[model samples]
Target: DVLVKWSEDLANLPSIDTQHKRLVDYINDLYRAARRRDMDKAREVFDALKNYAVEHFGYEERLFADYAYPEATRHKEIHRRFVETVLKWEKQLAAGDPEVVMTTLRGLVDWLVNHIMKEDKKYEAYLRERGVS
Candidate 1:
């Protein structure tokens, strides 16, 4: 259930890729529970993922600000939107829809990979050049 490979570059510090590894690991657990139609477990794991991820989002935002990355404004907005969608999923899980759980799970994996490989890489490339790690 390796939902996504840990694809972040080796050039990246573990602070980034290592946290991403946890996210992937947790997300795979989430999807496995979702697939089993265990709404209870899914909701529980969703909360677990959410609690960890918001902190990661903020840390990256802080990284952006500390480095004065040009896209910091847009990046934080992206994180805000991501949080909102996740919160939406949490509500759907409480509504007790198995179909919705799978849908949300798919979206979660889709959104995260894109955010990591694309949106997050933008700042990674920028900050690395500046020696911000």
Candidate 2:
């Protein structure tokens, strides 16, 4: 039941905030399609989601490397989980279980917010401790 506006939370970052916002937008698109019972729209958004998900993760990994973030390895592992889960849900949607996309979307929404605010923001804490902010 997430609305489009939930994207705002994803954009609260010094870097890659917009990328996170775009990811939320993609998730919202999928939600809209599922709500309309439009499998085709869901399918299209699903494809876009796969591509964007990969791109965003790559972008974040590169930034981590550049910043020399201490948790780069663990961060990459988290990104891997996000990628795999998205692809798994994509496969489910492609199999005509489109509602599964909605369920997955909800999980993604929750996970993104929690991960970004709590988990990912841990780096922000590290950066702050080092006076990067």
Candidate 3:
């Protein structure tokens, strides 16, 4: 699994910059918790993830709506799908399966990285075109 770093490479839109950093920190915490076999830490990380998905998803979705991003509907649906998937895995982890947390979180991190890099980048170009940069 690829480890996420809290660096400028992750930044796309300034509006969600700090929130993205928080999410990356949460991902790092999950990796550490998994390595330590700490269920408590896993649960904490899971909470951060659930909270971030809700908060950050709203902010991004709103931006898409405001900007009239061509892919607004698709992106919003993708965000919903991610929230659903993570919530499902979180529930499974809460059932006392720590390994599932690690596996599912790793997949989510990969998806998030691609979304931020590829999908989000598409909107960045839109914003730049509209002088929102």
Best lDDT goes to which candidate? 1
For each candidate in turn, the TM-score is 0.88, 0.82, 0.85
Candidate 2 per-residue lDDT over residues 1-133, each given as its tens digit: 4454654545445556777777778888888888888888889987987798789778767767877898999989988988888777777777676567668777878877888777666676555555442
Q: What is the per-residue lDDT of model 1 for residues 30-124, given as tens digits with 9 covering 90 to 100?
A: 87886788888888888999988999998898898888989989989999999998888788788876688778878988998888877887777
Best by TM-score: 1
**Candidate order (TM-score):** 1, 3, 2
- Residue 103 of model 3: what lDDT? 88
Model 1 misplaced stretches (Cα beyond 4 Å): 8-11
Q: Better model by lDDT, 1 or 2?
A: 1
The true-versus-predicted C-alpha distance at residue 6 of model 3, in Å, is 3.4
Candidate 2 vs candidate 3: the lDDT winner is 3
Clashing pairs in 3: none
